[PDB]
Design a protein around this ligand. Sequence first.
Ligand SMILES: CC(=O)N[C@@H]1[C@@H](O)[C@@H](O)[C@@H](CO)O[C@H]1O
Ligand SMILES: CC(=O)N[C@@H]1[C@@H](O)[C@@H](O)[C@@H](CO)O[C@H]1O
Ligand SMILES: CC(=O)N[C@@H]1[C@@H](O)[C@@H](O)[C@@H](CO)O[C@H]1O
Ligand SMILES: CC(=O)N[C@@H]1[C@@H](O)[C@@H](O)[C@@H](CO)O[C@H]1O
Ligand SMILES: CC(=O)N[C@@H]1[C@@H](O)[C@@H](O)[C@@H](CO)O[C@H]1O
Ligand SMILES: CC(=O)N[C@@H]1[C@@H](O)[C@@H](O)[C@@H](CO)O[C@H]1O
Ligand SMILES: CC(=O)N[C@@H]1[C@@H](O)[C@@H](O)[C@@H](CO)O[C@H]1O
Ligand SMILES: [Cl-]
Ligand code: NA
Ligand code: NA
Ligand code: NA
Ligand code: NA
Lengths: 636, 635, 634
Amino acid sequence: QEQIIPKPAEITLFTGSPARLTPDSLIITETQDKAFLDQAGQLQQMLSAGTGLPLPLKPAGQASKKAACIVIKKDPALAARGEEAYSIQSSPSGIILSAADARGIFYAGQSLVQMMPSVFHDRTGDKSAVRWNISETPFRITDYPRFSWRALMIDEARHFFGEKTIKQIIDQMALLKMNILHWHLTDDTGWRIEIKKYPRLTSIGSKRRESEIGTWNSGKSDGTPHEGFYTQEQIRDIVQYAARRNITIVPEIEMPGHASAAAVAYPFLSLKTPGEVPTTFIVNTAFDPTSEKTYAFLSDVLDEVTAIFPGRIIHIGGDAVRYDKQWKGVPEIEEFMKKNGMKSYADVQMHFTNRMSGIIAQKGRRMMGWNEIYGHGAKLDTNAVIQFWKGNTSLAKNAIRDGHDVINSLHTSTYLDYSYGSIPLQKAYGFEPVFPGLEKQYHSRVKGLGAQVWTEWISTPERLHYQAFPRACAFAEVGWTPAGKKDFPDFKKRLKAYSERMDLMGIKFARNVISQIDKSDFFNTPRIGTWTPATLTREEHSFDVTKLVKASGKHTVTLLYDKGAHAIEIESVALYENSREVSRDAHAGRSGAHKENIQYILNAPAPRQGATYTVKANFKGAGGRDSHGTVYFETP
Amino acid sequence: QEQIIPKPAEITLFTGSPARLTPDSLIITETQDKAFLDQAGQLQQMLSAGTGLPLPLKPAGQASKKAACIVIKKDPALAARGEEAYSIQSSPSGIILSAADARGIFYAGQSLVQMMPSVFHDRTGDKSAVRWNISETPFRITDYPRFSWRALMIDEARHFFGEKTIKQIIDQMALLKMNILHWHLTDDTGWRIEIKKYPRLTSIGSKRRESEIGTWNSGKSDGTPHEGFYTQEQIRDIVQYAARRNITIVPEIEMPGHASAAAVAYPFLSLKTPGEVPTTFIVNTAFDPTSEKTYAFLSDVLDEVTAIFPGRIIHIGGDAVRYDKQWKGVPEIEEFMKKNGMKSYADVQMHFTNRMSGIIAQKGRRMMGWNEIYGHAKLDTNAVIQFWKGNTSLAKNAIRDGHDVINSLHTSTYLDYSYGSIPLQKAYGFEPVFPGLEKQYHSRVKGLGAQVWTEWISTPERLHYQAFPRACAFAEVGWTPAGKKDFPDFKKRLKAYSERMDLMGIKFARNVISQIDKSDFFNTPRIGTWTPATLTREEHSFDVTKLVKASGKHTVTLLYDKGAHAIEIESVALYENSREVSRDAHAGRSGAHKENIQYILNAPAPRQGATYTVKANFKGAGGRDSHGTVYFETP
Amino acid sequence: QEQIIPKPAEITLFTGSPARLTPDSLIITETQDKAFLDQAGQLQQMLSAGTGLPLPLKPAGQASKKAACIVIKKDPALAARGEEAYSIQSSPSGIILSAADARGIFYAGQSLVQMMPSVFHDRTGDKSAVRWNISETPFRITDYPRFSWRALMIDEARHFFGEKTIKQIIDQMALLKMNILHWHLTDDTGWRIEIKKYPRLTSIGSKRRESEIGTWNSGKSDGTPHEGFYTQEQIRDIVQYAARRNITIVPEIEMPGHASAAAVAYPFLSLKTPGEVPTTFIVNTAFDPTSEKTYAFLSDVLDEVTAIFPGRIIHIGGDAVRYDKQWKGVPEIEEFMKKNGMKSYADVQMHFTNRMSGIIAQKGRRMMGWNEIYGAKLDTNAVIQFWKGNTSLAKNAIRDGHDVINSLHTSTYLDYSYGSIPLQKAYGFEPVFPGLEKQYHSRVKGLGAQVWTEWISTPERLHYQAFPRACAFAEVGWTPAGKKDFPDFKKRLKAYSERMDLMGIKFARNVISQIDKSDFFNTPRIGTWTPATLTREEHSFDVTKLVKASGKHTVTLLYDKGAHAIEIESVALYENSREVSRDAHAGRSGAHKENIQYILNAPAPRQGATYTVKANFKGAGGRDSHGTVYFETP
Ligand SMILES: CC(=O)N[C@@H]1[C@@H](O)[C@@H](O)[C@@H](CO)O[C@H]1O
Ligand SMILES: CC(=O)N[C@@H]1[C@@H](O)[C@@H](O)[C@@H](CO)O[C@H]1O
Ligand SMILES: CC(=O)N[C@@H]1[C@@H](O)[C@@H](O)[C@@H](CO)O[C@H]1O
Ligand SMILES: CC(=O)N[C@@H]1[C@@H](O)[C@@H](O)[C@@H](CO)O[C@H]1O
Ligand SMILES: CC(=O)N[C@@H]1[C@@H](O)[C@@H](O)[C@@H](CO)O[C@H]1O
Ligand SMILES: CC(=O)N[C@@H]1[C@@H](O)[C@@H](O)[C@@H](CO)O[C@H]1O
Ligand SMILES: CC(=O)N[C@@H]1[C@@H](O)[C@@H](O)[C@@H](CO)O[C@H]1O
Ligand SMILES: [Cl-]
Ligand code: NA
Ligand code: NA
Ligand code: NA
Ligand code: NA
């Protein structure tokens, strides 16, 4: 049925047969705007490669007749919905793609691919036999993002991955309509940008002798040198590759902290420069806030950043320095503080980060940073963007009420380096970027969200995939789909289909995740009973569903363990019409810490007026009766 | 691909590939008989939309052997088997559908449909993706019905469903080759046929304030008015729609009982007319059999019935009046009985139905009624007797007296009953020839009828649930030769046929189709049992040395019989002497509920002089009180 | 790679869509070599019938490049790899079949068949519904056999099957690229070759009253007469049937032992001729080696053999006579040993086989025999077939100038059960004798697998014993040693089995999923269980050092000894404390074994983390159980 991730804003389904691309189908451009023509050509190349169909570009050929073509239109009425909005009208007569801005057409194409057979992505095989149907019926889609900032961050400073890997990540982002690549390119353990005025930033800072592994303070090492960096020509190519796929790159140059690799290259940049690039991930060196050379150096670097990154926003990091380890007691710090009348080390960081916002602004750019740039001593430039990642949400809300745009990256929801125990798939999908205590008038200041793939413990592309996917798919939906249309069980079904595409595209996403059952699948589902140690003193259990049996069809009963030392063993679940059985699903299930076949399918008859309907479930405690659970009843 | 329900009478399979309908295929008529030409237009129109292929009608001689074409022949050889017989000769040379009467061709086309992909029935399906193969090999089919009367009754008096629903029912009947729609159109709770001479029959009799729900005497009501009736224009349109699909409509005007709606419309028609159309289903009002105006009124009604229903037979119901509630101690009745020398209230009823049989005969029609109309001024010998009661001697005597009889034993054919009361198996096992009837009389047993009473049926979907799939079983009972009936095979065929019902929108009962029944194994070898004593060990050995004669798949079925505990099955293996040569190790459970109780073993080509042993590892589930039987099928 | 059995020697895959044959496809020959034009017509006939496509032959230059065409070229470069070598270049623009010798084109065709839908083998199947793709991508194959002698032996002396059955055996051999049919046609219990000069060999020797069943000296029999033989016309027909499919027939006339049938027909041929053709399989009668009549009679037989069997090599068996039962204490033997100075009965047999090898050499042929023929003079060109695992003897045979074939009986005797020789043992067989030095390897020309038929009385039982282990021996004979891979072979054997089904081969269906401890001599062991360990349900096995890549790892719990099995409920993989994969299903590991393999999805490993396999199992009826837990990577 409907399988697009993100789920689009407005969908209208019609009855009949769907559109199908054939060897006779054409792509017609009914506009002269060349931005739309460039998108049309890029759309032709993509669709032809994946389907094998020729799909040549023509403004003529009429619209054939019984050969559904692709029509690209420029519809001004969608402009109220932003430059990323588009509409799709699909029927056997035609497939019309419209947008106010050319970027909408690209996203229309991605929706088109996701409504076609997944084999589109196969690099092998006979595709001349595929039925290239667009969904299962005719339809009208009007679509647009809830949030304008839908970001994925890749940390290449902790471990470098390179052009091939990041282009493959960009491909996943575009297919999910994520539009910001936050590129964390500098940190203590690596510097990954060629700066032509300062060659040692890469010739020294891009190489280290070994890497700590396992976890922080593991005492374990791989004893393996690690190096890599991007040349400025590579960065230009990747910027272009991303922009063609509707993605703006936000570069991050960490400061005043996370500066070890830069300091080793040029030791005057820090008051406590390490002897070599750190081999452990527990070292955080800080730039010297008391020497103009620091600011002069950083401004020269930022000059080259702006020449090769056209995006308006530059991320400085700006998270808190480890004051005790780095500045406390250093004479250059204490005198600097006494002179300028500063009471705290945090005041010294605020001074640095405020000065950098003026340096960034004088380059025609806009500064972004982690929420410490805002506070907790003068105040920060109102134009600065704040990425919230930790603390009381009152800090983000205070910044919003003071006039800052905010990106919600609360680390307990969005840090993809964490395990699936720490952030399960349902926690990623249930993330709500708009802080709940924030008054409605302020909501438009929450521009969106960012998911972070930190790479201390990620050294291969396949491990990067394992950590980033499938949860990045959830964040793409949180960023795009209207809040009122979010639906976690439905998202997980669509995720199964989408996981075929990830396989064919080489993405080693986490396996044991997509098909789990969690209690969050059932907030929108009726509850018909429970079990307790007391109800386990019998094995036959009856639950009334009279009010829920309104029509013929399939009903799914789920016995979901909640807590207790013991699971339940389930023999069968049946539906009774009055006192007679009319459907039974007999199969062994176990609902406890592990959930094994806990869903039972019941076939309801067209209801008998005046009859009662009862779900009867035969189950008992497994090794004991300390078991609590809930019985859910789905009526699709 | 012998999927057809009902099972055809004679089939001979060949070797090779089957015929396939392409966009080149044609339908050519090899006969000028107009009845065949009208049916060919029907066949072409149906098949074109189902398959999405042109399938053009071209006069004979324009047959290109590029593509297999459909040939519609007329073969007088088939007349020995009646007007509904036909033959299908299938091969890439072409598909030849022959028949002595045009009705045979229609059924040939329905069989054609059940041999093609089910996508035929999907209206929005991608039909151009399909290969329209007729079954899977060449074949000759010589088909005809065992019984001439294969009827389904729809009650629209209790609840009215209307034109769209009844055409949908007619469609399912036609695909199952059922040929009689018994239309129960009047009863106590409704009158659904427009009678122009007596407009209150519909203006009053077709409306009631509310309906009892749940069951008789429930004390529950839906509080919802219910109304509806067919105009005579609607009935003519539905008569033709049915006639196109080989179905004769037998109308029923209930009498002398089930008269409440007629009486309330015209209170002189009953001695105990209710004050309003009953809101419950326990009220059964009787026409007044002592008054001439009653007979003249009903004779008038039947005049209008005959004008719009072309069928030869008119049903009156004629089941017993509730004598003690309606007639006993009523002065008119008691004196009528003295004047006529009658000793029982049944005598009064029989006088009424006897007289109605003459009134109907004089209109050039035949009366039909339930067995109450038959006994030992008198009953027209051309009357048809339909039996709800299992009384073989009464049917014997009716046959000797010259009556065609129809068997509708209510404990087997009443589809308003639950599946506990009448399981699918019991419907399929129904034998219309009354048990013990001497063979001399079998030929007057003209068929069967299955009844959908609608007291507790208010939607088309619930009508489907009660009517199907047991109506499929009766279609087979009525068509298939008795010696070719095979319930296990019917169940396999029904599983396929239910795909068609799904796409056609028939909300049949889903849980009743794919059961395993103990009767399935009556002629399957028994290699062992289990008892509480044998469940004290995990491993169980059964000798099958004398049964393993060829390589291939052997099926072990561990079938629970009785006891408080099921058995949980870990694996079943085949041993050649002391060597394991096959093991099916899926988890199974056989008890009150059946969970994967069939185990597939691959036998080697048998080795001379070797012992073969089925070893089954199983134990009691929760205890040892369990008995069952182990069956062994060869390929 | 492909699904072809045997695995080709060199494969190169590319991205994209595969070549596809259509009704417009043609077969084009770009060589004038008439041997290639002949193979091309035979290929056309075979492919058009299987696919239902017309596939007409067209000359180079008169074709439309609309559809993919098959192009047949002669490539002398492949000559260094022998006459059976070939290459295939396939893409949507064409399918080029190349070979140095016309025999290679036939094997190129057999590989094409295995890369197309299996409906090819269904004579009645719906062939027009099928997309005739050559595999799933463009590819380049260069292929050639490792061994030149890839033999299957069928014993029709013990039980006669006949022409229809041997031809369907030949069809399998050809699809598997086996090139030698070793035809065991004479023995104690039957003589199956018509010899016109000695008509009693078949009129007497081809008939027996009944057959022993069960096992040797069972005392049981079937009370059923059994008879049959091939006429010389039938032989010539089967010889050319094999030759059209790249197979040379090596006939076998057993001597000096296994002679009962011959002797009963002509009693002067043995010193201990039985009274009737034996009806048990333990009787082994010896020809009389001390009498000139025997050699004259056998030379006459071999004259007729050479006229209907054209191949260079004739097999005599030559295995040891039952000396104590047949020759010891016989006056003619003891006097013959005195006259000639022989000290052992084996010397008498060696004199016999040595002399037969000269008789066979004088007819323009090469003698072949079991290792007893090597250990007046043995013809230096004789071929030695080893049922005995004796490397020093094979080395000496090679040093004395003999080609040798390896048929180690404990690995290649397909009359044995699958317990004695499981599929994996057949596949793991190495024809190069263990310990043989490299300089001698070139004289190991291949292998032979033997279907003895004492206990095989039907074609279907022949299939059950012969297949699928014959499929493994086909791969041993052809595939390079370093490209062998038993798991991948079982994967391909699944697909090859559809072809066997459609072609009527009643192969043993259960054996591909058998598991033996021998399956795991080269698989890591991550732990064991013992009566000690069975006191708890949860068990933990470290696999930190073994998790190196993403994908499916397999845990096998294999019972070794003890009076009790274990019942298994679940097996899970843990990354530190995070459960990351769980295979929950019921299994049992004891005298019989069910579902004892558990499949786990490893993520891309996290450097420095610990990976732990956790398994739930307990004792079945007790705790006297010992086992080994194995761990396989993807
Ligand atoms: C602002 C920020 O996110 N800093 C670090 C980040 O660099 C990374 O090390 C992460 C790993 O979980 O932990 C954070 O404390
Ligand atoms: C979410 C997070 O990373 N929190 C802190 C962070 O401040 C980091 O800088 C480090 C300092 O030691 O410890 C972490 O626990
Ligand atoms: C919540 C839960 O799964 N509890 C136990 C489980 O830990 C396991 O010990 C087994 C014991 O029988 O089944 C369940 O009773
Ligand atoms: C002759 C006959 O079938 N009469 C009634 C019928 O009208 C219907 O009410 C049915 C419901 O089961 O009960 C029968 O007694
Ligand atoms: C006859 C029968 O099925 N008995 C089963 C019993 O064996 C056991 O499985 C139990 C599970 O708690 O359910 C019972 O209904
Ligand atoms: C040399 C040789 O293989 N001789 C016999 C062979 O004839 C056959 O009887 C086989 C059956 O197992 O046993 C072998 O010992
Ligand atoms: C090694 C082995 O299988 N031992 C089993 C034993 O554990 C128990 O299960 C018993 C049940 O029948 O049978 C024995 O053969
Ligand atoms: Cl005998
Ligand atoms: Na569509
Ligand atoms: Na407020
Ligand atoms: Na003799
Ligand atoms: Na672990």
